[PDB]
Design a protein around this ligand. Structure first.
Ligand SMILES: CCCCCCCCCCCC(=O)SCCNC(=O)CCNC(=O)[C@H](O)C(C)(C)COP(=O)(O)OP(=O)(O)OC[C@@H]1O[C@@H](n2cnc3c(N)ncnc32)[C@H](O)[C@@H]1OP(=O)(O)O
Ligand SMILES: CCCCCCCCCCCC(=O)SCCNC(=O)CCNC(=O)[C@H](O)C(C)(C)COP(=O)(O)OP(=O)(O)OC[C@H]1O[C@@H](n2cnc3c(N)ncnc32)[C@H](O)[C@@H]1OP(=O)(O)O
Lengths: 334, 334
């Protein structure tokens, strides 16, 4: 008999940079209301959204992901050659196959590197970040790209009074690699598969394919149900993430929850009992909810405005579809 | 400034068990030959396939994954309560969201546990396995389910003379957890994004959705290119996985390549230069190509026939869409 080798990589792993891509076209609340009975004022006070970006027709979750990666690499002072793997997290790659990751890799000039697509609603970034961290620590890679990307706008039913003003397009990537001190806390994650219907595609693609004369699929949302779940449960998730990371709530400088809704997030702020001067991500204002892309996009907004600084202690909480959640403490990149 | 804490999991991780779900309906080559100009003889000698199983209309990738997990749990002497996380790998979950994993978790009676969907063509399993091992060793979980599942049959163009006889339905899961001795070698993985068109959905869902009554999407395949790529490249992949695991080719007792084609796989046998008596998975004979699910399904097939024993040193090689590949040495479960 023989033994399978026991291996390990670098223990200390961190975020080296963030890179954000936001589509050109700006969509105002007045524009969104062109098919629903609503107002700009209502939408804003209910969601915290003022505007959002929609990508062009020639753009995709993969294409925006690539731009986001190019930017993250630039901000890290690295090239494609430095990366060992890419995990794409998204809910809007509109192909059963091929995966987006290998495509992104080839467009970056690193066609050979490992990679896969990971889906878990808005929690995808948290799961993907944790996954890169585990892999790097396990020695399966030294440096990786983790990119959240979303082209949600083609899934929106403009007549849906419950959600048409919520979702938007964009991508953001983080470079993950070895750092002098631990930059990514342990992953806290879970789900509620009993509420799988709360955020969904209503009609599966095959069903749609077989009945073209029926309705087409759209994103459907049980808003209040999600609101209750998130505002009620994400305080404990955050607490477990900070506990695993061995940091107190008073030590958090930056709160970056998934940008689902500003009312939920400000509720989670009070709940987590961060300190008064704690910086709270509000990228939802002109970005809207970009699911898997929301957290890294928000990290980038906090950094480009200087509201957050490199090295700040941050709490990331992703929550959403399937009813999935993932959270971790991290040191801000760049 | 406080340093972020690091959590720790198991050092030795293994496959405790495997469970296989195979759909009731058997589709013979002659049945496939009702819509293409071919013969049973041709298909068999060119692919190694005699028959394949197709799932019922009311079955899905998530539902077969669930049955597969239940059996895997049963074969390990465990219940849902013992599982900390589930990763569903598939290419045929026909919803952008919610993800399959939380749904499967809830059907199993463990609705809270962490989980996500992983897509990487047929290499999904290897990536999913590698990720589960990384998370367990990293201490994000102690015991996990990794389930490969595929309902490919509704994506087949029955008139496509190049592929209609290749893909099939089924699911199989492994229980992954701590073992006395190292049961899972290091992941060796990569891709070839320049050949993303080799195996693909021809029409993306959104384009299709905006012209439903026109042509619908189907799985398309540049077979000779894939054949060439796999037979020429997977020998070195295997060799890297074995070198990583610190094992010699003469020490492998069981070869389990992705069941894409029996001609490719037998070429890889000669290429890797395994010993004469080494057991080679040939589940493809009556299972067909089940992508993400093929390796676990084939593992299960070898064990139920006694051709393989639990504890045998196995080389797993997954290759397919996006042009992705993942390989590792492991000890057989159950
Ligand atoms: C291609 C397919 C692929 C589809 C698949 C695409 C992939 C998707 C991937 C998603 C991945 C994720 O998980 S992303 C993260 C998920 N996050 C979220 O969904 C955000 C969380 N959502 C929320 O918190 C909520 O939606 C709120 C609070 C923002 C929305 O509040 P609300 O639900 O509108 O409030 P409520 O009044 O109770 O709701 C009912 C309605 O609002 C009222 N209303 C609306 N506007 C007005 C108004 N101006 N004046 C008075 N009332 C108004 C209407 O009566 C309307 O009726 P009616 O509505 O009853 O008709
Ligand atoms: C909703 C959408 C989502 C869709 C998305 C669904 C998700 C998919 C997920 C996939 C995930 C994976 O990675 S799965 C792993 C992928 N694996 C594979 O694809 C398996 C590898 N493939 C192969 O080995 C190949 O396909 C072969 C060798 C089986 C096919 O060879 P081939 O068909 O002979 O190729 P070709 O050179 O075109 O043949 C040329 C000529 O040969 C003869 N010929 C060809 N076929 C036949 C025939 N059946 N019977 C008699 N003769 C024939 C003819 O004279 C023909 O005519 P003429 O040309 O002279 O006129």
């Amino acid at each position: 008999m023989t033994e399978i080798a026991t291996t390990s990589g670098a223990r200390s792993v961190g975020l080296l940079s963030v890179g954000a891509y936001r589509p050109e076209r700006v969509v105002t609340n007045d524009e969104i209301c062109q098919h629903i009975d609503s107002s700009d004022e209502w939408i804003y006070t209910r969601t915290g959204i003022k505007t959002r970006r929609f990508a062009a027709d020639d753009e995709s979750a993969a294409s925006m992901a690539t731009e986001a990666c190019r930017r993250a690499l630039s901000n890290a002072g690295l090239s494609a050659a430095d990366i060992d793997g890419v995990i794409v997290t998204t809910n809007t790659h509109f192909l059963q196959t091929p995966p987006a990751a290998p495509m992104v890799a080839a467009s970056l000039g690193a066609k050979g590197i490992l990679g896969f697509d990971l889906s878990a609603g808005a929690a995808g970034f948290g799961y993907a970040l944790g996954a890169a961290a585990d892999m790097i620590r396990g020695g399966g890679a030294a440096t990786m790209l983790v990119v959240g990307t979303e082209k949600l706008s083609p899934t929106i039913d403009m007549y849906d009074r419950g959600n048409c003003f919520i979702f938007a397009d964009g991508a953001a990537a983080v470079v993950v690699g070895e750092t002098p001190f631990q930059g990514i806390g342990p992953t806290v994650a879970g789900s509620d598969g009993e509420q799988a219907d709360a955020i969904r595609q209503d009609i599966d693609w095959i069903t749609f394919a077989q009945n073209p004369s029926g309705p087409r699929p759209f994103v459907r949302l049980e808003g209040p149900a999600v609101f209750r779940w998130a505002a009620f449960k994400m305080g404990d998730v955050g607490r477990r993430a900070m506990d695993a990371a061995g940091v107190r709530p008073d030590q958090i400088d930056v709160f970056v929850p998934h940008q689902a809704n500003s009312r939920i997030n400000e509720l989670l702020v009070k709940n987590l009992q961060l300190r008064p001067d704690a910086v709270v991500a509000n990228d939802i204002e002109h970005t809207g909810n970009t699911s898997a892309a929301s957290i890294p996009l928000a990290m980038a907004e906090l950094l480009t405005t200087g509201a957050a600084k490199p090295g700040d202690l941050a709490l990331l909480i992703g929550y959403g579809a399937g009813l999935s959640y993932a959270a971790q403490v991290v040191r801000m990149p760049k």
